[model samples]
Target: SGAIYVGNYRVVNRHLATHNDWANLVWEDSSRDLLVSSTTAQGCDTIARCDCQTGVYYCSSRRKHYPVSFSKPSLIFVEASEYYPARYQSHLMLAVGHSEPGDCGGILRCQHGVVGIVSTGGNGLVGFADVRDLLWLDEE
Candidate 1:
């Protein structure tokens, strides 16, 4: 159909897929807030007085960095040719961090998606060893 631009790479609109391993992976940063006050020896306010509101903790550092190369044989698209699957629609699931149609970093069938990283000069597709376990925080 059409193509979307990822950085400078043109990704096809209809072909998309998810890495079989990362399909169900999910990451969440969790932290607890102990009330801070001078009244308590632990620098925390009394149980009743402590009021800490914390939302779901996601990686504060939005961007995830992985060592990408272009020689890894595992750099293959697991799924492709779908209009848009449910797994590719959310950031926590597939979205890389953008509002574009295919603004996700999860595995997909985009032109560049399978080709690995690209250089700013548009030299070509760079490959990387599959680092699914190292990057996918939720991986068990």
Candidate 2:
């Protein structure tokens, strides 16, 4: 840790910098915080996004639309890609069926073959399903 003076007082550089307490702030935490703060004011939760490319997953809250319109808005975007993991199939299904605290939906993804969902409301909403081996499915 280092110290830097920010006027008459010396501030610890470690404290000034981002930390794990910020919890994934390096990625999209800042934007997600803003979205949630703004939407909650209007009694609505924000919608989020999940983009999967191979086994890697990138999920975050999407930008809020202006003029305050709601119509179960067509909010998800799925693209054709070369690497589709076994996990994505379950994640996609969970995302399609998820709802926020008041029935609003957000982003969802599959991690380790289990469905994980996150919304402007909270995180760690996981869905479980029966798993079958590839050979078993093929035999059926």
Q: Which stretches of candidate 2 lie over 4 Å from their true place?
A: 1-20, 29-98, 102-111, 120-140
RMSD of each: 20.4, 19.1
Task: Report clash pairs, candidate 1.
Answer: 17-108, 69-127, 69-128, 70-127, 70-128, 96-104
| Candidate 2 worst ten-residue window by lDDT | 31-40
Q: What value of lDDT does candidate 1 attain over all alpha carbons?
A: 0.21
Residue-wise lDDT of candidate 1 within 1-140, one digit each (tens)?
A: 12222221222211322242133223211110001111111211111111111111112123333332122223233222233222221111111222222222222222212221111011222211121122221111
Using lDDT, give the best candidate's number: 2
In candidate 2, which residue pairs get closer than 3 Å at backbone N, Cα or C atoms, i.e. clash?
Answer: none
Backbone clashes for every candidate come to 6, 0
lDDT of 2 at 83: 24
Error of 2 at 57 (Å): 17
lDDT of each: 0.21, 0.22
